[PDB]
Design a binder for this molecule. Structure first.
Ligand SMILES: *[C@@H]1O[C@H](CO)[C@@H](O[C@@H]2O[C@H](CO)[C@@H](O[C@@H]3O[C@H](CO)[C@@H](O)[C@H](O[C@H]4O[C@H](CO)[C@@H](O)[C@H](O)[C@@H]4O)[C@@H]3O)[C@H](O)[C@H]2NC(C)=O)[C@H](O)[C@H]1NC(C)=O
Ligand SMILES: *[C@@H]1O[C@H](CO)[C@@H](O[C@@H]2O[C@H](CO)[C@@H](O[C@@H]3O[C@H](CO)[C@@H](O)[C@H](O)[C@@H]3O)[C@H](O)[C@H]2NC(C)=O)[C@H](O)[C@H]1NC(C)=O
Ligand SMILES: *[C@@H]1O[C@H](CO[C@@H]2O[C@@H](C)[C@@H](O)[C@@H](O)[C@@H]2O)[C@@H](O[C@@H]2O[C@H](CO)[C@@H](O)[C@H](O)[C@H]2NC(C)=O)[C@H](O)[C@H]1NC(C)=O
Ligand SMILES: *[C@@H]1O[C@H](CO[C@@H]2O[C@@H](C)[C@@H](O)[C@@H](O)[C@@H]2O)[C@@H](O[C@@H]2O[C@H](CO)[C@@H](O)[C@H](O)[C@H]2NC(C)=O)[C@H](O)[C@H]1NC(C)=O
Ligand SMILES: *[C@@H]1O[C@H](CO[C@@H]2O[C@@H](C)[C@@H](O)[C@@H](O)[C@@H]2O)[C@@H](O[C@@H]2O[C@H](CO)[C@@H](O)[C@H](O)[C@H]2NC(C)=O)[C@H](O)[C@H]1NC(C)=O
Ligand SMILES: *[C@@H]1O[C@H](CO)[C@@H](O[C@@H]2O[C@H](CO)[C@@H](O)[C@H](O)[C@H]2NC(C)=O)[C@H](O)[C@H]1NC(C)=O
Ligand SMILES: *[C@@H]1O[C@H](CO)[C@@H](O[C@@H]2O[C@H](CO)[C@@H](O)[C@H](O)[C@H]2NC(C)=O)[C@H](O)[C@H]1NC(C)=O
Ligand SMILES: *[C@@H]1O[C@H](CO[C@@H]2O[C@@H](C)[C@@H](O)[C@@H](O)[C@@H]2O)[C@@H](O)[C@H](O)[C@H]1NC(C)=O
Ligand SMILES: *[C@@H]1O[C@H](CO[C@@H]2O[C@@H](C)[C@@H](O)[C@@H](O)[C@@H]2O)[C@@H](O)[C@H](O)[C@H]1NC(C)=O
Ligand SMILES: *[C@@H]1O[C@H](CO[C@@H]2O[C@@H](C)[C@@H](O)[C@@H](O)[C@@H]2O)[C@@H](O)[C@H](O)[C@H]1NC(C)=O
Ligand SMILES: *[C@@H]1O[C@H](CO)[C@@H](O)[C@H](O)[C@H]1NC(C)=O
Ligand SMILES: *[C@@H]1O[C@H](CO)[C@@H](O)[C@H](O)[C@H]1NC(C)=O
Ligand SMILES: *[C@@H]1O[C@H](CO)[C@@H](O)[C@H](O)[C@H]1NC(C)=O
Ligand SMILES: *[C@@H]1O[C@H](CO)[C@@H](O)[C@H](O)[C@H]1NC(C)=O
Ligand SMILES: *[C@@H]1O[C@H](CO)[C@@H](O)[C@H](O)[C@H]1NC(C)=O
Ligand SMILES: *[C@@H]1O[C@H](CO)[C@@H](O)[C@H](O)[C@H]1NC(C)=O
Ligand SMILES: *[C@@H]1O[C@H](CO)[C@@H](O)[C@H](O)[C@H]1NC(C)=O
Ligand SMILES: *[C@@H]1O[C@H](CO)[C@@H](O)[C@H](O)[C@H]1NC(C)=O
Ligand SMILES: *[C@@H]1O[C@H](CO)[C@@H](O)[C@H](O)[C@H]1NC(C)=O
Ligand SMILES: *[C@@H]1O[C@H](CO)[C@@H](O)[C@H](O)[C@H]1NC(C)=O
Ligand SMILES: *[C@@H]1O[C@H](CO)[C@@H](O)[C@H](O)[C@H]1NC(C)=O
Ligand SMILES: *[C@@H]1O[C@H](CO)[C@@H](O)[C@H](O)[C@H]1NC(C)=O
Ligand SMILES: *[C@@H]1O[C@H](CO)[C@@H](O)[C@H](O)[C@H]1NC(C)=O
Ligand SMILES: *[C@@H]1O[C@H](CO)[C@@H](O)[C@H](O)[C@H]1NC(C)=O
Ligand SMILES: *[C@@H]1O[C@H](CO)[C@@H](O)[C@H](O)[C@H]1NC(C)=O
Ligand SMILES: *[C@@H]1O[C@H](CO)[C@@H](O)[C@H](O)[C@H]1NC(C)=O
Ligand SMILES: *[C@@H]1O[C@H](CO)[C@@H](O)[C@H](O)[C@H]1NC(C)=O
Ligand SMILES: *[C@@H]1O[C@H](CO)[C@@H](O)[C@H](O)[C@H]1NC(C)=O
Ligand SMILES: *[C@@H]1O[C@H](CO)[C@@H](O)[C@H](O)[C@H]1NC(C)=O
Ligand SMILES: *[C@@H]1O[C@H](CO)[C@@H](O)[C@H](O)[C@H]1NC(C)=O
Ligand SMILES: *[C@@H]1O[C@H](CO)[C@@H](O)[C@H](O)[C@H]1NC(C)=O
Ligand SMILES: *[C@@H]1O[C@H](CO)[C@@H](O)[C@H](O)[C@H]1NC(C)=O
Lengths: 435, 120, 120, 120, 53
């Protein structure tokens, strides 16, 4: 007769939601807070394990979201508060060689700033982007800063970069992370090849909207992942199997000056522009871009009708923060017009130039109670990034438009292959063996 | 040969790696890390307390005096141990678990009292 | 029959609910929650360490080789074990506790050395 | 007779104070103190887990079935246990320690499986 | 009470009473008289067990 035998150390697990901690590899940003990583920690193949994955229901995403926002806010705690600067600014047109594209984009404003002494004021003359100021009370030359009628602006500290240093997510003892290695995995359902890891690879916390930059590429083919593909209320995350190179610039040689506005409190502002005034822009190779969309279309036709029409169009609405391609390029915040990328209909060394707007006072996260002022950067800025995926939304003829307003989508595009489970080492089975 | 490497293997093979998994159970900002460390310890201790209650303290493979009521799983010892992985077994008999644990506790209580009465 | 349900019963009855109580020993705003969890663990581990020192690890009932000096309590075996609750017993022999613990420790050290020599 | 009092004495003497040392292993401003308490617990538990793996749970002196390959230390008993202090011994055979621990683990696994097949 | 608000700073609002619609009257509370007298009678009966009868 078979009797109960208790085994401890049994290789069994259950789905679980627990706390993960961050780690990193070896001008301070998104660090100190995380533990240094182990070199080449471990990966165990788990040769005969099949397991079910379900991105979008994955709480690792929520934790990464919370950590990034929290660390972001923490970095501003010791920085100068630009509340003494919520004043009447007198603003006129910029006296330089301005191309047509830049007319009305910059204003030369003069304000009275506070000083080291409480009883003294100074007179400062600085350039502002039009998007950061608002005219007021029917006075032709009188402006105020955009966010003094809501939150206090905090100046970001000049010594802190926003470089997207990769963050690894590590399991606590008693937990493990399972990794799906199926090259055709679309975010849900059974995964035939699942390995075990200690900690995820580092993921760069890049913040952008409609085009995902510097992420992972699909191993073989473009993969379209969505919670419910026939539900037009859902976003579609499209991973590319090839990068598209994008070259962005702010072609204006700026002089940055600073003043004290308080007791050891420095304020930074664009003083003057050397040379001509030109619009910021991004360059995308035309042929590469057309090949990229053709691949996306071929894959969309597997979910939509085959003998169909697929149309790409620009966003139909919303504010600048969601109708453009937002990204951080060398510390400056760009809002680029992608209508030059999504203007075609697909039926059954030239380049595309995207004009860009620049803002210094930004909100980062979709929040109301915070603002931040990005100090301007001296000189001219250039950056080159890889487009690794698109975020699309959907309206015969299926029409798709750029989306991406919700940041958790960016993090899902990297965390989709990971699952957290709890180890359950204790269990029983019948064995022919009695005390 | 590593942690959970045997998860896809048959129970009769996987049982030889019990020490591999056992050793992976132990090891305001910073508070969530303390919470994770504290719960790892609490879960560990509960499993050890339970093995103690059942009279399985100090061992990875513990034979008991409780018999296998076929109504839990009427499968035979060339199927359970040679054709099923621990994950599939755990699912098969997950309903009838807080019966088995209760029986193991009762059996040990009787064994302790019988053993004191002999040592007299 | 639940936690401390036997507290008002006689020692000879209460001794059958030892698992009921053993199972209830485990599990800045909010920091005190962690402090409470940590101390619960520390107290638990001290009891387990002490049972280990005395050679009672893994058991709820442990017989020893230390004899009961009448000076601690001269009550006969059926005035203690069916006429007196555990609360009243603890009060009766509170002063003479650390003595007993010291004797138990010495007894186990003698027991461990003797056994070692017999396994040569 | 206190904690580490025997540290400078010979192994053959120091082996009698094992309980003295075992008892000293357990017990924003205030966080680092909480962290210290948590790590003290984790170190304690790892040693206990390891003793459990080797089949030494519950005891301070544990004899095993693994032999002493002379290549680790070719000194005779009446050197090791009469002259050297534990500190000098620990340094002498520090290198070849992970090898010994691995052997102890394997020995216990073989023993647990052999016993399972003797209770059949 | 008609409540008004102003900004006093950058996202900092202050709330205050603007004016009063209708007559201005004193705030007050109502305790039933008999109920209160019975309540004290019970309290008195118990006080008399600690104090003289
Ligand atoms: C996608 O990935 C690419 C590749 O990593 C990334 O481009 C990189 O951006 C950084 C930040 O702008 C560049 O680093 C600078 O390079 C210039 C070279 O002239 C240096 O002078 C800079 O040093 C000064 O500024 C620092 C500011 O933090 C100071 O700390 C320092 O003391 C100096 O004053 C700095 O090193 C880097 O060169 C490029 N890499 C390449 C190959 O071009 C891109 O930004 C990523 N895209 C997104 C959206 O994240
Ligand atoms: C925006 O308005 C400000 C204020 O009018 C302009 O700054 C001023 O620019 C003039 C012309 O460049 C400066 O005059 C120069 O002064 C230097 C010495 O400081 C002298 O060597 C030059 O020969 C010339 O006289 C003036 O000083 C400067 N004021 C400040 C506060 O710097 C600014 O150029 C305007 N920006 C544009 C392009 O609209
Ligand atoms: C073996 O189990 C049978 C069937 O028990 C049912 O299934 C078990 C998994 C568990 O859920 C039981 O509670 C279920 O009743 C037992 O037969 C029954 O036993 C219970 C007492 O446990 C009794 O009340 C019922 O009248 C019995 N009859 C049935 C068929 O329901 C059988 O006694 C168990 N044997 C052992 C070894 O305990
Ligand atoms: C049993 O106890 C008697 C009385 O000891 C007293 O009470 C004990 C609880 C403890 O507190 C002792 O220290 C107390 O002295 C012991 O008798 C005396 O023991 C002490 C210490 O050994 C000794 O100095 C006295 O001379 C003893 N007196 C007598 C009357 O003999 C007795 O030794 C204890 N026996 C055991 C088994 O330890
Ligand atoms: C006893 O040890 C010898 C050699 O010991 C090795 O070096 C020592 C300093 C120490 O680090 C030991 O643990 C090492 O094993 C063993 O002989 C060698 O054994 C290894 C496998 O362990 C084998 O690969 C070599 O070819 C052997 N030959 C050599 C170089 O001596 C011996 O097997 C050990 N015997 C026992 C009983 O374990
Ligand atoms: C983006 O593309 C434009 C258009 O091809 C580039 O502009 C040319 O730059 C060269 C070098 O300075 C000039 O000689 C040409 O006359 C410019 N073309 C035109 C139409 O004005 C631009 O340099 C590219 N750059 C980025 C992203 O930095
Ligand atoms: C990007 O640029 C295009 C122009 O190429 C803008 O599209 C125009 O938008 C206005 C409404 O504001 C319409 O009346 C025009 O008919 C549109 N033009 C074309 C060719 O369709 C577009 O709004 C800009 N988008 C962003 C985010 O800046
Ligand atoms: C174990 O069972 C094997 C298969 O038996 C048949 O199929 C299983 C699924 C049940 O439905 C069973 O009742 C059937 O008879 C046998 O080939 C094997 O010999 C059995 N071994 C033992 C020890 O019983
Ligand atoms: C046990 O003793 C009872 C009387 O108790 C006496 O006083 C108590 C405080 C102790 O000192 C005890 O040893 C004394 O004998 C008797 O009534 C009872 O019958 C006795 N029972 C047995 C089992 O002998
Ligand atoms: C123990 O050893 C002492 C030193 O002699 C030798 O060196 C040590 C390392 C061993 O290898 C041993 O076998 C050698 O004899 C001796 O002085 C002493 O007599 C030895 N005692 C015993 C009990 O053998
Ligand atoms: C500014 O533009 C005018 C033409 O409108 C030109 O004559 C002048 O030289 C330009 N100045 C500079 C500094 O380029
Ligand atoms: C200044 O810019 C405004 C547009 O914001 C334009 O209407 C006005 O004519 C410009 N004035 C001069 C002198 O360029
Ligand atoms: C600030 O003023 C602008 C004027 O266009 C208005 O749209 C916005 O809602 C105001 N914000 C607050 C917090 O009152
Ligand atoms: C872009 O893709 C190329 C492919 O050869 C790779 O070498 C490069 O590092 C990628 N750039 C970024 C920023 O990931
Ligand atoms: C993802 O794969 C599952 C496989 O069961 C399929 O049912 C689902 O429709 C697929 N979704 C997308 C967007 O490919
Ligand atoms: C997908 O969307 C359609 C919309 O008609 C709905 O009927 C269906 O239940 C949804 N399926 C899932 C899995 O959400
Ligand atoms: C980006 O700049 C590099 C030179 O560093 C050039 O080879 C490449 O073609 C440019 N890419 C685009 C899209 O213009
Ligand atoms: C869709 O068209 C492709 C050719 O582009 C063909 O291989 C595939 O079988 C077609 N699918 C269906 C359902 O007709
Ligand atoms: C789309 O392309 C056509 C080509 O004739 C052009 O006229 C139209 O302005 C373009 N639309 C956008 C938004 O660029
Ligand atoms: C900006 O102008 C200054 C003039 O002194 C020159 O030294 C510097 O190199 C220029 N920077 C760029 C990016 O053109
Ligand atoms: C996986 O299953 C095959 C039989 O299909 C077996 O030969 C192999 O040994 C199993 N792998 C593992 C790791 O158990
Ligand atoms: C169980 O045995 C069957 C026999 O047909 C085999 O096909 C199957 O792969 C085996 N499964 C495992 C987990 O070994
Ligand atoms: C356990 O009970 C649930 C009740 O919903 C049932 O669905 C499941 O199949 C049962 N599993 C077994 C038979 O162990
Ligand atoms: C309380 O005392 C009565 C009378 O001796 C007894 O019957 C009852 O069982 C006792 N209660 C408990 C919990 O032991
Ligand atoms: C309790 O103790 C008293 C006094 O010795 C005794 O008379 C009585 O019989 C005892 N009762 C029981 C149940 O032991
Ligand atoms: C223990 O000692 C204290 C102080 O001497 C004394 O008051 C108490 O009654 C004693 N209790 C016992 C159990 O003897
Ligand atoms: C220290 O060494 C001396 C011999 O030099 C010995 O008599 C004494 O007992 C030793 N003390 C300890 C604590 O081992
Ligand atoms: C111990 O050390 C002393 C002094 O070095 C030496 O005389 C004695 O022989 C040693 N005893 C042994 C055999 O270890
Ligand atoms: C232990 O290892 C170190 C480094 O390899 C070496 O220097 C030392 O001699 C070794 N000691 C022993 C006891 O072999
Ligand atoms: C409070 O109002 C209710 C309204 O239903 C009334 O019945 C009750 O008597 C009032 N209480 C007092 C103390 O007047
Ligand atoms: C309160 O109770 C006393 C009792 O002596 C009585 O005389 C008095 O009239 C009562 N008052 C009321 C309002 O009931
Ligand atoms: C107080 O008076 C009441 C009512 O006559 C009576 O019942 C009670 O016993 C008296 N108490 C004392 C202390 O006289």
């Amino acid at each position: 007769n078979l009797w109960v035998t208790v085994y401890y150390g049994v290789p069994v697990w259950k789905d679980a939601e627990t706390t993960l901690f961050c780690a990193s590899d070896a001008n301070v940003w998104a660090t100190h807070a995380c533990v240094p990583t182990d070199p080449n920690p471990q990966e165990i193949h788990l040769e005969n394990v099949t397991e079910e994955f379900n991105m979008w229901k994955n709480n690792m995403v929520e934790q990464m979201h919370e950590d990034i926002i929290s660390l972001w806010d923490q970095s501003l705690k010791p920085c100068v508060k630009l509340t003494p600067l919520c004043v009447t600014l007198q603003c006129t047109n910029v006296t330089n060689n301005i191309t047509d594209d830049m007319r009305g984009e910059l204003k030369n404003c003069s304000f009275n700033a506070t000083t080291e002494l409480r009883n003294k004021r100074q007179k400062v003359y600085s350039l502002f982007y039009r998007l950061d100021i608002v005219p007021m009370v029917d006075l032709w030359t009188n402006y105020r800063l955009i966010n003094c009628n809501t939150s206090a602006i905090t100046q970001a500290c000049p010594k802190v970069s926003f470089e997207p240093i990769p963050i690894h997510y590590c399991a606590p003892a008693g937990f493990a992370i399972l990794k799906c290695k199926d090259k055709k995995f679309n975010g849900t359902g059974p995964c035939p090849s699942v390995s075990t890891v200690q900690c995820t690879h580092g993921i760069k916390p890049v913040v952008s909207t409609q085009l995902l930059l510097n992420g992972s590429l699909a191993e073989e083919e473009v993969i379209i992942r969505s919670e419910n593909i026939t539900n037009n209320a859902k976003n579609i995350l499209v991973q590319l199997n090839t990068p598209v190179q994008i070259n962005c610039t702010r072609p204006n040689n700026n002089t940055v000056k600073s003043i004290r506005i308080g007791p050891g409190q420095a304020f930074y502002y664009t003083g003057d522009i050397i040379g001509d005034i030109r619009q910021a822009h991004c360059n995308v190779s035309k042929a590469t871009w057309n090949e990229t969309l053709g691949k996306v279309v071929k894959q969309l036709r597997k979910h939509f009708g085959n003998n169909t029409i697929i149309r790409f169009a620009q966003s139909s609405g919303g504010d600048l923060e969601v109708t453009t391609h937002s990204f951080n390029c060398g510390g400056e915040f760009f809002y680029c017009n992608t209508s030059g990328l999504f203007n075609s209909t697909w039926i059954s060394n030239d380049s595309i130039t995207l004009p860009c707007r620049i803002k210094q006072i930004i909100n980062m996260w979709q929040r109301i109670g915070q603002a931040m002022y990005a100090p301007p950067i001296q000189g001219v800025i250039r950056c080159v990034s890889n487009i690794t995926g698109l975020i699309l939304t959907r309206d015969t003829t299926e029409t798709f438009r750029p989306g991406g307003g919700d940041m958790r989508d960016n993090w899902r595009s990297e965390l989709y292959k990971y699952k957290v489970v709890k180890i359950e080492p204790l269990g029983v089975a019948p064995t022919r063996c009695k005390r | 040969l590593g942690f959970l490497g045997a998860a896809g293997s048959t129970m009769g093979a996987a049982s030889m790696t019990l020490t591999v998994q056992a050793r992976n159970l132990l090891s305001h900002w910073g508070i969530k890390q303390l919470q994770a460390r504290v719960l790892a310890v609490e879960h560990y201790l509960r499993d050890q307390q339970l093995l103690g209650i059942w009279g399985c303290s100090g061992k990875l493979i513990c034979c008991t005096n409780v018999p296998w009521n076929s109504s839990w799983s009427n499968r035979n010892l060339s199927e359970i141990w040679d054709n099923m992985t621990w994950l599939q077994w755990d699912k098969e008999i997950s309903n009838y678990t807080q019966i088995i644990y209760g029986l193991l506790e009762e059996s040990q209580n009787q064994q302790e009292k019988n053993e004191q009465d002999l040592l007299a």
